[PDB]
Every structure is written in structure tokens, then in C-alpha cells.
């Protein structure tokens, strides 16, 4: 199928409580595989998947050097951004960065991205064409000009189209069992009486992968969102996902409602009814 | 593999 490799960085200043906390996480699709936490003791880029453990020691030295330097540029960015917005040195602020590349089913480069957030809001981002920038405010315009002068877009492009996809393909092969699987959802329906007349029909999807799923309810085979509850897809803790949809129903009428389950691991969409 | 290049805001 199509796949992606993504890195997420979060840097939080704590004025007068230590150097800023810095957390980096690496993902292939929905599966985490590396980790760095500046408050952890190891001070290393640690593995978080089994298939990444078969990298050599020189890989872990190199990722650790690159991630420790990431942390320091973010420590600097925090200072710069405080300046840019005329903020005090008492407030705790947040720098977020996300970058990655997507490959299609032939595993060839398809799309690249590099975005920054400051304080929960968009700051600057590479445009889909990987040649321009989208600066959010006036402050971000300053960074746009710094990076256009240094040709930063061009340089990111050579990582996104180069090392990024080429290492995404190596990870996809090393982890073929984990990463190329589709786990079809294990579905079932439950019935919980609320009153002596009203009932809850809950439609469950469990142990699936990837996380992309659709749950919808129908009444007499007609789409119904009224009186329904959807919870956000949640991680099971073992690398699969869960989700449920629920509809409150007048008792006696349960048999009119059908839950429908779409997931790419299913040859055909499931239909579930109360029985 | 993380990118080597470091940029500054």
C-alpha cells in the first residue's frame, strides 16, 4: 500500500526549572519506532519497535547526534520566538515540528512536508511543491526570508526525496511483518438498557490495523447520525486500534438498526444487527 | 533516519 515516515518534535521551555524539555518521536504509518526524551536518563535515541533493533551501533550514535542537535536548535528557536513576539521570560512556551515523506504503493516518493508550530498555532510550513513557504503571521515572515536566503527549501527537498524515502523503504522491509500487515477489525455489538424503555446499541471494532476505519449507523437501512456517539479511534496498547459507535434506541425497535464497518482489512464491509 | 541539516527560526 502507500506508506509514510514521520518525525514529531516537541520542545517546552520551563523558565527557572531547567533546560527546556525536548521529546522526539518517529513513526512509520501508525507504528512508533524511535524515541528521544531529554528528561530520560539514557540521553540516546532509543528503539521502540523490534524491527529497528537490528540497526547497528553506528546508526544509534548518528541518530543520537542528530536528535541532540535538533534539541539545541529548538532551545535556540524558543529564545528567538520569545523575542519575535515580545513575550516575557516567565512564560512557558512550546515549539512543535513535524516532517516526513509519503510513498505510494510503488514505494516511490509522492509527497513531502515540514511544518512548525509555536504555542499551538501554525508558524511556518513548507508548501506542497517543496519550493515555497507558508508563513502564518508577520513574525514568521522574518523566518521565511532567513530560509529563502539560505535556500532551506531546496535543502529539505533533498532529504525528503532522498534519505527520507530511501530509509522508509528500508524500514518497510525490515518490518514487513509488523508494517505491511492489515489487521481486520474484530467486531461485535452490545446492548445496555438505560431505562425500562430505552436501550443503547454499541458497535465495537477491536484489534485492527491501520487505524483508518469508518463506523456508521443505519435505521431501516437508512443513514442516521441523530442520537449517535462516536469515540475517537484509540490505541489498544499493543499496536492495534479500537473504536466504537453507539446509538440510543427505543426498546422493541433494536432490530431496525444496523452498524456498518469499513476497514481496508475487510474483503467487504460488515453489517451488524442486534441478535 | 533523522535529517542531518539543522535550521534556525
Amino acid at each position, epitope marked *: 500500500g502507500s506508506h509514510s515516515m514521520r518525525y514529531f518534535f516537541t520542545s517546552v521551555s520551563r523558565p527557572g526549572r531547567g533546560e527546556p524539555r525536548f521529546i522526539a518521536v518517529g513513526y512509520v504509518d501508525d507504528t512508533q519506532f524511535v524515541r528521544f526524551d531529554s528528561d530520560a536518563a539514557s540521553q540516546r535515541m532509543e528503539p521502540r519497535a523490534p524491527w529497528i533493533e537490528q540497526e547497528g551501533p*553506528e546508526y544509534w*550514535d*548518528g541518530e543520537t*547526534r*542528530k536528535v*541532540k*542537535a535538533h534539541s*539545541q*536548535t529548538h*532551545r*535556540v528557536d524558543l*529564545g*528567538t520566538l520569545r523575542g519575535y513576539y515580545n513575550q516575557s521570560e516567565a512564560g512557558s512556551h512550546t515549539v512543535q515540528r513535524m516532517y516526513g515523506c509519503d510513498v505510494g504503493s510503488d514505494w516511490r516518493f509522492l509527497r513531502g512536508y515540514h511544518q512548525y508550530a509555536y504555542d499551538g498555532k501554525d508558524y511556518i510550513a513548507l508548501k506542497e511543491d517543496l519550493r515555497s513557504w507558508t508563513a502564518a503571521d508577520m513574525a514568521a515572515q522574518t523566518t521565511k526570508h*532567513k*530560509w529563502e*536566503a*539560505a*535556500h*532551506v527549501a*531546496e*535543502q*529539505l*527537498r*533533498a*532529504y525528503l*526525496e*532522498g*534519505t527520507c524515502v*530511501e530509509w522508509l523503504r528500508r524500514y518497510l522491509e525490515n518490518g514487513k511483518e509488523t508494517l505491511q500487515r492489515t489487521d481486520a477489525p474484530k467486531t461485535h455489538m452490545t446492548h445496555h438498557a438505560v431505562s425500562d424503555h430505552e436501550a443503547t446499541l454499541r458497535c465495537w471494532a477491536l484489534s485492527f490495523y491501520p487505524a483508518e476505519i469508518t463506523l456508521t449507523w443505519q435505521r431501516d437501512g437508512e443513514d442516521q447520525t441523530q442520537d449517535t456517539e462516536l469515540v475517537e479511534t484509540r490505541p489498544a496498547g499493543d499496536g492495534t486500534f479500537q473504536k466504537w459507535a453507539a446509538v440510543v434506541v427505543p426498546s422493541g425497535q433494536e432490530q431496525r438498526y444496523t452498524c456498518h464497518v469499513q476497514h481496508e482489512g475487510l474483503p467487504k464491509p460488515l453489517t451488524l444487527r442486534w441478535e | *533516519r533523522l*535529517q*542531518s*541539516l*539543522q*535550521i*534556525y527560526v
Partner: T-cell receptor
Framework: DAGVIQSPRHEVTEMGQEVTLRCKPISGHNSLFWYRQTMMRGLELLIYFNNNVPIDDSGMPEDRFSAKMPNASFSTLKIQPSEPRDSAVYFC?????????????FGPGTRLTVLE | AQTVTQSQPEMSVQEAETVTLSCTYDTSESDYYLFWYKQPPSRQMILVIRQEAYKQQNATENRFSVNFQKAAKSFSLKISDSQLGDAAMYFCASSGNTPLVFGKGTRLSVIP
């Protein structure tokens, strides 16, 4: 001069003494690098700063070497105590600080000889 | 993970003839820059020529050109119509995990 300034051109000290080399970056540059050149090891990166924050101090000798960048206009690299093995040419370079690929502009160096 | 190799420490060229200075390198990524630096006996480092690894065209600066062969990880420096002033140490260099890493350097002598 509007280049990298390095005080002083040469310096002879006796071992055991203190040694403090100073460097001023090109104005507007926000990133400063220290190197040392030897005939044995070549050019070795020592430490560098961006915005006066120490970004990497891998190559610093583990015990006798210290560096500060108190503000954007100057940086000191300090040796205490000096030992003959510290004799080298100590180069300072600056860059705009926008990216690690920015072109580095080098000072004339301070060649230090530490005599017994 | 980041090395620069200059195999010949001493090269000679006859004045006005051309000379090629060899350089190979190992790099772990695809976002790197390559550089040639000159150091005259004055010890001042001067940038001769810069190659961005994403650019395909070989970089040329007057009589200085490079043979950038990415797949071979080779980056030799061609000095044509060489001059007495070209006598110096030349250093191949790269930007990667570290912002500048220098090879061991080649001392070029220009026989007048």
C-alpha cells in the same frame, strides 16, 4: 576590519599557566565556531554556538578546556591549566546562523605554544 | 559517519599547467554540502568553491572547477592555468551531522 577578529595573533605561555583566546564574529553573524589545527590531527572542531547557545561540545577536551559566548559580539575559549599538548593554531569562524550549511568565515587564528 | 579522504598529501604542478586535487567522502544522508578551502602560508582559510549536493551542475569558479560525482562520492578540484599564488594547503570539506568536517589536506607546490 569587518572580518573575524582574533586576539592575539601569537601567544607563548609556560605550562601550568592560564590561556584565554578571544574571538569576535563578523557583525550580523549569529553563529560562532572554534577549531584547532595541529600537524598530528589536522582541523578539529572544538565547540560552536548559535545565538550564544552552545550547540555541540563533543570535540572539547574532557577536562581543561572551557568556552563562553557572553553576547553576540565575542567568545572566549579558555585553557586551564595549559599543557604543551595544547599547542596548536586555534581558529574561530562565524556564519549567519540560518543553517548548518551556511558558509563559514574563518579568522586568522591564534597559534599558541605551551613550553615546558 | 562523516569522513573526508585526501589520499595524496603532496602535489606539484608546473606554473600555468593544470592540476586535479582528489577527494572522496563518506556521508550518511542526502542533505549535505561539499567545500574546497585554501590555506596560504598566512594560515587564513579562504573558500575556493562550494557544491550543494542537491545541485546537479558541477560548480565552477573562474579557473577552479570540481568534478562532482555523487554516486562515486568523489569531489575533485581542478586548478587550470596554475599560478604561484595557488601554492597552499587545500582542504576538502563537507557539512553533515557536523557543520564542517575537513579532510587531511593536500599541500600543492607550484614550480615557477
Amino acid at each position: 576590519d569587518a572580518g573575524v577578529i582574533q586576539s592575539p595573533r601569537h601567544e607563548v605561555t609556560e605550562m601550568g599557566q592560564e590561556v584565554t583566546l578571544r574571538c569576535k564574529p563578523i557583525s550580523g553573524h549569529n553563529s560562532l565556531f572554534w577549531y584547532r589545527q595541529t600537524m598530528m590531527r589536522g582541523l578539529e572542531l572544538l565547540i560552536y554556538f548559535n545565538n550564544n547557545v552552545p550547540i555541540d561540545d563533543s570535540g572539547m577536551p574532557e577536562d581543561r578546556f572551557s568556552a563562553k559566548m557572553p553576547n553576540a559580539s565575542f567568545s572566549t575559549l579558555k585553557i586551564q591549566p595549559s599543557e604543551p599538548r595544547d599547542s596548536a593554531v586555534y581558529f574561530c569562524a562565524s556564519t549567519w546562523g540560518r543553517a548548518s550549511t551556511d558558509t563559514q568565515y574563518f579568522g586568522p587564528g591564534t597559534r599558541l605554544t605551551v613550553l615546558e | 559517519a562523516q569522513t573526508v579522504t585526501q589520499s595524496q598529501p603532496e602535489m606539484s604542478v608546473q606554473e600555468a599547467e593544470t592540476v586535479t586535487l582528489s577527494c572522496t567522502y563518506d556521508t550518511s544522508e542526502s542533505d549535505y554540502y561539499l567545500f574546497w578551502y585554501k590555506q596560504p602560508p598566512s594560515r587564513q582559510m579562504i573558500l575556493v568553491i562550494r557544491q550543494e549536493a542537491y545541485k546537479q551542475q558541477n560548480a565552477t569558479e573562474n579557473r577552479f572547477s570540481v568534478n562532482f560525482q555523487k554516486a562515486a562520492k568523489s569531489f575533485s578540484l581542478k586548478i587550470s592555468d596554475s599560478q604561484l599564488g595557488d601554492a597552499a594547503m587545500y582542504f576538502c570539506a563537507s557539512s553533515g551531522n557536523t557543520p564542517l568536517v575537513f579532510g587531511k589536506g593536500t599541500r600543492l607546490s607550484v614550480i615557477p
